[PDB]
Amino acid sequence: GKSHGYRSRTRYMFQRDFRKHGAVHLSTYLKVYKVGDIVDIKANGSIQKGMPHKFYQGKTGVVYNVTKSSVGVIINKMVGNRYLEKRLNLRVEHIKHSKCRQEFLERVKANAAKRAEAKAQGVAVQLKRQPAQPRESRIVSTEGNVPQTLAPVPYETFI
Amino acid sequence: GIDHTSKQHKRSGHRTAPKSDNVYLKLLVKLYTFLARRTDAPFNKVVLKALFLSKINRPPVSVSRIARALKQEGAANKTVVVVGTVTDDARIFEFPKTTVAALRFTAGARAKIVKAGGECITLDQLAVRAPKGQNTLILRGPRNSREAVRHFGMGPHKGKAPRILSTGRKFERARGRRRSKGFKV
Amino acid sequence: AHFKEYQVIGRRLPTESVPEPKLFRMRIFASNEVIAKSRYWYFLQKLHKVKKASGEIVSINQINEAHPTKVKNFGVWVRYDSRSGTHNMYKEIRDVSRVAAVETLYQDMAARHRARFRSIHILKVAEIEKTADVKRQYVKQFLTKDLKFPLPHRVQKSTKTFSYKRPSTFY
Amino acid sequence: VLKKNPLKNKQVLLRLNPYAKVFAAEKLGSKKAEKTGTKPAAVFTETLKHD
Amino acid sequence: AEQVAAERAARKAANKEKRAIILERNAAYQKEYETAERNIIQAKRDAKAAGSYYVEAQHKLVFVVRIKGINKIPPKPRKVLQLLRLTRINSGTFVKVTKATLELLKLIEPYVAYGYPSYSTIRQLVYKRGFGKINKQRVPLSDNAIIEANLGKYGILSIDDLIHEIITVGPHFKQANNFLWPFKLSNPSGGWGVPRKFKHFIQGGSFGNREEFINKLVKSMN
Amino acid sequence: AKSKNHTAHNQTRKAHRNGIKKPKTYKYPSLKGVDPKFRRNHKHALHGTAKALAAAKK
RNA sequence: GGAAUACUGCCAGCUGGGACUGAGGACUGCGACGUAAGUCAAGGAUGCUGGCAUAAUGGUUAUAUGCCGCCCGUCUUGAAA
RNA sequence: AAAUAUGUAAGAAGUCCUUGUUACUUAAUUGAACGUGGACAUUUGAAUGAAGAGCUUUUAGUGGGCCAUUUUUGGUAAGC
Ligand SMILES: [Mg+2]
Ligand SMILES: [Mg+2]
Ligand SMILES: [Mg+2]
Ligand SMILES: [Mg+2]
Ligand SMILES: [Mg+2]
Ligand SMILES: [Mg+2]
Ligand SMILES: [Mg+2]
Ligand SMILES: [Mg+2]
Ligand SMILES: [Mg+2]
Ligand SMILES: [Mg+2]
Ligand SMILES: [Mg+2]
Ligand SMILES: [Mg+2]
Ligand SMILES: [Mg+2]
Ligand SMILES: [Mg+2]
Ligand SMILES: [Mg+2]
Ligand SMILES: [Mg+2]
Ligand SMILES: [Mg+2]
């Protein structure tokens, strides 16, 4: 018959790494999680307690609860045609801080500093990001760079 | 052909021109559609849309609700406006000297208001007193207090009132409702 | 189509590690400039590590024939793909311009080997400046002294459906 | 009630654009450019004519 | 209160002042257009004289025309066409060129013909098929007061102001381009020039980026 | 008589008819599943805060 | 060395022929030409003329001709079967 | 170790400054959470589009499917 257990099809997913087996380093336990932090979920196969289900591997959530060895995480899951919120109790070995939020935070800090320094001058702040613009005109010299002509090559066997 | 991004020929879904064929109500909506077209005050549009409403969307407003609304700071001399029925409440013992404009007053509500010394007013008298709705206070009754809304969204772990005729022991208090009989909900 | 020859010069995009890249040039036979730039990027991707996103085109210029009313003999070296493999061919074409020579080359390849434009590479085309270096008989027979030939069996095209006398094919 | 095309109907062209009258007056559609006698470099010509 | 002469004369005087403003603006636009084109031509000539190569700036503006019907479209290109407002065959829209819009065009390549529009075809498009979106209604432009009332916040007063904002991709290109209703072109008057539309232009078909030949196609379709 | 066993054909079209709307986010999400020791402290802290604010703006 | 011409493109350059349409129904708007009066091709056709005034146009109907058209209802993935 | 698909983020429910409550926590005004007052507004924080956005009740029919390009299993294969 068919087989859909809890860790079905998780062979390579919960495999450890190459040359990174063994005990986990102490920085994962020394990290501090507060309610509202944005975290990434990646299960550690050597820690069988407090594991996330295979659906949440590679998912990003928000902390809502802090306990002795674990963190409560909220994930939005697509079921049918809408999302439901799911509350996960994960040990901190399967959790790391997300870096997207902190990049946006440092952008906000630099943006506010730029706005504040330009507030005393009024110099058209230009605080929005822009996409990659089409490149402007340029002059390409041939001093030491006289153009070299290329031609297609004939067929050869090469074995 | 057009790659339509929205449904074609769909109605707005909002009730204009109320379903009632009460001729006095039609006169009232004629007056207030004139006022809402030509006075640019948001009060007239709000009360026109309220005049369109159905009965369950016009719950009665009690005189206790009116007194509680008049107890707000700076709202003591405002004209209370109820597009609907005003019922009274014997749970209050003192009532202020307000002016209340409404579609209908019960006998107890009208007696309570005129005994406290205020007055009961129809919406067209409200229109000639405050054409732009000056110094008015619109009150709405509780929509989600009906008996029918108890059953809306019935399901597991909802706490949402089974549709049932008889109540008591042995009417839906067994398997599915306690842990001793299978499971609880 | 009716071909034009273009020089296309392009390069890799400049970086801080290396400003002034090496400016590669090609001669492309193409119907228009859009196709010319597409073929430039195709062949440069065959040759060097670059593509359109990481490179740029600094120049494209049409090259006119220098003497478009002188009769030349061209040698053409071609790479092409058959249904079974890849082959090199040398052909030679008597014509008045390089673009006319490559047009009749593409016609001849499609006629004789069913080779389509996507299957042909022009390795090179070059004027054979001296006779007796012409090595194909089908063009060498036009290089004899005081050449003249008739045109037997002239077929004269009528404008009317009915003719009132038997036609003549004299010429 | 009816969309009259500019680029015909010079009346609606002059209604939309007052500059069209003086554009036609100085004939800016056919504007003669100033002649310049500059010549490309020998490196450009030999690169163009290179085999 | 005669009220048929006094405020009528005042309105006429205000109209003459607005027309004078539009006239001097259009003179300035024409002068800067011709200065830009002569400067580009002369820069190319000077680079050739110096022995260098003038690489002109990449195009900032494309015109995109839907070439395929509405049946049998995959969902991601269908969504991108809807977001570019090409919901009908022979519908056209101007697009500002950035990395984001370039990736959109790469998504919808086999259903559009696009390229770089010139001043003449932009002017003919806006003059002949020029419709503004005023409270979700498609209104023929036909007068400068419409453009005054709907785009006058961002300095745009006339149809040539709108044309200038489109061709020189200005700070309110997004607002002006969204104000313009999508252009409803016909089929081309001389045909498509190919036996078969749905190959790339490079392969002898019709879709993709024909760079400067979009002017010929759009003028035959307009 | 055999039949079709399973397919997900037409299912994403059905979901996308009036489908994949995002959940509503609110200020103050619910506190259920949070540590009961924390909640027990939190109720007393909020009661004391309410008394302090009432005495301040009495 | 000095031109010409091709090709490509632009003109708010000029001009001839053909076809289909004429919605709206006092005025109001934006313009153009004029010092002005006013005029105009400027928010949708008017002017001039002829024949007939009747089965002539037209309608209906039978027929002929060109091209097209399988039997309905039903179950069904699928019906002219 | 790709390509294609896939989670999150791109602000006012944000960021910073100062300091009240608690029976929690700490060696400890240490912290945690929730709080009072102030500052930063239209380039308020990428693009494009929005055709309105959000919410609810109730009920029909349906729950035999088949076909094409590409991915793909059994089978020599099949209009399997
Ligand atoms: Mg792994
Ligand atoms: Mg265990
Ligand atoms: Mg119309
Ligand atoms: Mg024709
Ligand atoms: Mg064809
Ligand atoms: Mg079934
Ligand atoms: Mg089974
Ligand atoms: Mg010409
Ligand atoms: Mg008859
Ligand atoms: Mg007849
Ligand atoms: Mg008849
Ligand atoms: Mg018959
Ligand atoms: Mg017949
Ligand atoms: Mg037949
Ligand atoms: Mg059957
Ligand atoms: Mg159902
Ligand atoms: Mg069912």
From Swiss-Prot, chain A:
Top-level taxon in the UniProt lineage: Eukaryota
Quaternary context: Component of the large ribosomal subunit (LSU). Mature yeast ribosomes consist of a small (40S) and a large (60S) subunit. The 40S small subunit contains 1 molecule of ribosomal RNA (18S rRNA) and 33 different proteins (encoded by 57 genes). The large 60S subunit contains 3 rRNA molecules (25S, 5.8S and 5S rRNA) and 46 different proteins (encoded by 81 genes).
Query: Which InterPro entries is this protein grouped with?
Result: Ribosomal_eL21, Ribosomal_eL21_CS, Ribosomal_eL21_sf, Translation_prot_SH3-like_sf
Site of covalent link Glycyl lysine isopeptide (Lys-Gly) (interchain with G-Cter in ubiquitin): K31
Q: What does this protein do?
A: Component of the ribosome, a large ribonucleoprotein complex responsible for the synthesis of proteins in the cell. The small ribosomal subunit (SSU) binds messenger RNAs (mRNAs) and translates the encoded message by selecting cognate aminoacyl-transfer RNA (tRNA) molecules. The large subunit (LSU) contains the ribosomal catalytic site termed the peptidyl transferase center (PTC), which catalyzes the formation of peptide bonds, thereby polymerizing the amino acids delivered by tRNAs into a polypeptide chain.
Taking the record's annotation, the residue ranges forming a coiled coil are: none
Q: Reply yes or no: does the keyword Ubl conjugation apply.
A: yes
Q: Where in the cell is it found?
A: Cytoplasm
Q: Which Gene Ontology BP terms does the record give?
A: cytoplasmic translation
Protein name, please?
A: Large ribosomal subunit protein eL21A
Also noted in the record is:
There are 2 genes for eL21 in yeast.
What keywords are annotated for this sequence in UniProt?
A: Cytoplasm, Isopeptide bond, Ribonucleoprotein, Ribosomal protein, Ubl conjugation
Q: What is its main location?
A: cytoplasm
Is Transferase set as a keyword in this record? Answer: no
Q: What family does the database annotate?
A: Belongs to the eukaryotic ribosomal protein eL21 family.
Extract one GO cellular component term from the record: cytosol
Curated annotation (Swiss-Prot), chain C:
Under the heading InterPro entries, the entry gives:
Ribosomal_eL20, Ribosomal_eL20_dom, Ribosomal_eL20_eukaryotes
TM annotation in the entry: none
Q: Give the record's GO biological process terms.
A: cytoplasmic translation
Give this protein's Gene Ontology molecular function annotations. structural constituent of ribosome
Q: Which UniProt keywords apply?
A: Cytoplasm, Isopeptide bond, Phosphoprotein, Ribonucleoprotein, Ribosomal protein, Ubl conjugation
- What's the main place this protein lives? cytoplasm
Q: Which residues carry this modification: Phosphoserine?
A: S31
Q: Where is this cross-link: Glycyl lysine isopeptide (Lys-Gly) (interchain with G-Cter in ubiquitin)?
A: K124, K130, K148
Q: Which Pfam families match?
A: Ribosomal_L18A (PF01775)
Extra info from the record? Present with 54300 molecules/cell in log phase SD medium. There are 2 genes for eL20 in yeast.
Family affiliation: Belongs to the eukaryotic ribosomal protein eL20 family.
Q: Which protein is depicted?
A: Large ribosomal subunit protein eL20A
Top-down, what is the taxonomic lineage of the species of origin? Eukaryota, Fungi, Dikarya, Ascomycota, Saccharomycotina
Q: What's the name of its gene?
A: RPL20A
UniProtKB/Swiss-Prot annotation, chain D:
Quote the record's miscellaneous comment. There are 2 genes for uL4 in yeast.
What does its PTM field state? N-terminally acetylated by acetyltransferase NatA.
Q: What is the effect of changing K4A?
A: Significantly diminished nuclear localization
Task performed by this protein = Component of the ribosome, a large ribonucleoprotein complex responsible for the synthesis of proteins in the cell. The small ribosomal subunit (SSU) binds messenger RNAs (mRNAs) and translates the encoded message by selecting cognate aminoacyl-transfer RNA (tRNA) molecules. The large subunit (LSU) contains the ribosomal catalytic site termed the peptidyl transferase center (PTC), which catalyzes the formation of peptide bonds, thereby polymerizing the amino acids delivered by tRNAs into a polypeptide chain.
Q: Which residues of the full protein are shown?
A: 312 to 362 of 362
Write out the annotated subcellular location: Cytoplasm; Nucleus
User: What does the subunit section of this Swiss-Prot or TrEMBL entry state?
Assistant: Component of the large ribosomal subunit (LSU). Mature yeast ribosomes consist of a small (40S) and a large (60S) subunit. The 40S small subunit contains 1 molecule of ribosomal RNA (18S rRNA) and 33 different proteins (encoded by 57 genes). The large 60S subunit contains 3 rRNA molecules (25S, 5.8S and 5S rRNA) and 46 different proteins (encoded by 81 genes). uL4 is associated with the polypeptide exit tunnel. uL4 interacts with its chaperone ACL4 and the nuclear import receptor KAP104.
Name of the protein in question: Large ribosomal subunit protein uL4A
Lineage top rank: taxon? Eukaryota
Swiss-Prot record, chain E:
In terms of SUPFAM superfamilies, this protein maps to: Ribosomal protein L30p/L7e (SSF55129)
Query: What GO biological process, any one, is recorded here?
Result: ribosomal large subunit biogenesis
Under PROSITE patterns, the record lists: RIBOSOMAL_L30 (PS00634)
The record ties this protein, via InterPro entries, to: Ribo_uL30_ferredoxin-like_sf, Ribosomal_uL30, Ribosomal_uL30_CS, Ribosomal_uL30_euk, Ribosomal_uL30_euk_arc, Ribosomal_uL30_ferredoxin-like, Ribosomal_uL30_N_euk
Alphabetically ordered keywords of this record: Cytoplasm, Ribonucleoprotein, Ribosomal protein
Carries keyword Ribonucleoprotein?
yes
Q: Which Gene3D superfamilies does the entry mention?
A: Ribosomal protein L30, ferredoxin-like fold domain
- Pfam families recorded: Ribosomal_L30, Ribosomal_L30_N
Transcription regulation found in the keyword field: no
Example GO CC term: the record gives: cytosolic large ribosomal subunit
Q: Where would you say this protein principally sits, based on its record?
A: cytoplasm
- What GO molecular function annotation could you give as one example from this UniProt entry? RNA binding
Localization: Cytoplasm
Q: What else is known?
A: Present with 101000 molecules/cell in log phase SD medium.
Q: Which proteins does it associate with, and in what oligomeric form?
A: Component of the large ribosomal subunit (LSU). Mature yeast ribosomes consist of a small (40S) and a large (60S) subunit. The 40S small subunit contains 1 molecule of ribosomal RNA (18S rRNA) and 33 different proteins (encoded by 57 genes). The large 60S subunit contains 3 rRNA molecules (25S, 5.8S and 5S rRNA) and 46 different proteins (encoded by 81 genes).
Q: Which family does it belong to?
A: Belongs to the universal ribosomal protein uL30 family.
- Protein name (database record): Large ribosomal subunit protein uL30A
Task: Name the species this protein comes from.
Answer: Saccharomyces cerevisiae (strain ATCC 204508 / S288c)
Q: Which gene encodes it?
A: RPL7A
